[PDB]
Paper text:
The expression construct contains a single-point mutant–C273S–which removes a potentially reactive surface cysteine, and that in our hands significantly improved the expression levels and solubility of the recombinant protein. However, crystals of hTDP2CAT typically diffracted both poorly and anisotropically. Through iterative screening of many crystals, we were eventually able to collect a dataset that could be truncated isotropically to a maximum resolution of 3.1 Å.
Consequently, TDP2 has attracted interest as a target for small molecule inhibitors that might have utility in overcoming innate or acquired resistance to TOP2 poisons.
Residue numbers in the entry: 112 to 323, 328 to 361
Write the structure that this text describes.
């Protein structure tokens, strides 16, 4: 009846206090108990802690070495059907789109995650990767509900310069009337995990939707509380999305 996903860039590259951060993120995931979990910037040790703490989830990794994405499926409700790792072409950061075809209740789904080129890379390649994600979203089978969710790293109206969004694809944040409480997924003013003195408020973590059923209900943020070490679980904010399986 209900349906929930959580997208989070756990910032696994920040090695400081990584144990307590992983314990906190696992506490959030265990508390909300979502059905699908999209994780970005996961390192093998973090993946080992996740697999150790989350046994009721099937974890599909985007790679093996370095950092990668991961998709966790609640085994008690989400039935894995297929998986495909679509690698980006001119990628200078070893990033790819992780697609996982699943079945929830009686509906088919296509859950996609990605971690596009970061701020240090080439914004043009980030736009190209966005076009590849949207194209792979449109070319999905005309029977499943495609749901993308991940750290897009987009800024400076790159969605408009990349040809815009197609007619059958919409941003869940924009669909809900652009709620201002979950307006920014990366805030250097409230989140003090990079030491950036300047206040840069951007919306990196995003969710794209298309259907052939499922309705986005609510949208929220998580990971806003400081841990015992005085740091947040990540430099990005978690993005919780609740849906209704009509
Ligand atoms: Mg990072």
């Amino acid at each position: 009846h209900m349906f929930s996903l959580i997208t989070w860039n756990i910032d696994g590259l920040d090695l400081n206090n990584l144990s307590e951060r992983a314990r906190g993120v696992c506490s959030y995931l265990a508390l909300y108990s979502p059905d699908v979990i999209f994780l970005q910037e996961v390192i093998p040790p973090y993946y080992s802690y996740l697999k150790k703490r989350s046994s009721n989830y099937e974890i599909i990794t985007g790679h093996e070495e370095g950092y990668f994405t991961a998709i966790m499926l609640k085994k008690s409700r989400v039935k894995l059907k297929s998986q495909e790792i679509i690698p980006f072409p001119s990628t200078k950061m070893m990033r790819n789109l992780l697609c996982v075809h699943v079945n929830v209740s009686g509906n088919e789904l296509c859950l996609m995650t990605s971690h596009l080129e970061s701020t240090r890379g080439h914004a043009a390649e980030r736009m190209n990767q966005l076009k590849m994600v949207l194209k792979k979203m449109q070319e999905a089978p005309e029977s499943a509900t495609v749901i993308f969710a991940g750290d897009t790293n987009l800024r400076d109206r790159e969605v408009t310069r990349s040809g815009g969004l197609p007619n059958n694809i919409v941003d869940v944040w924009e669909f809900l009337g652009k709620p201002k409480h979950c307006q920014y997924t990366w805030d250097t003013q409230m989140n003090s995990n990079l030491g950036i003195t300047a206040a840069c408020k951007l919306r990196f973590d995003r969710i794209f939707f298309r259907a052939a059923h499922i309705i986005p209900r609510s949208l929220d943020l998580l990971g806003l509380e400081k841990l015992d070490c005085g740091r947040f679980p990540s430099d990005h904010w978690g993005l919780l999305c609740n849906l209704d399986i009509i």
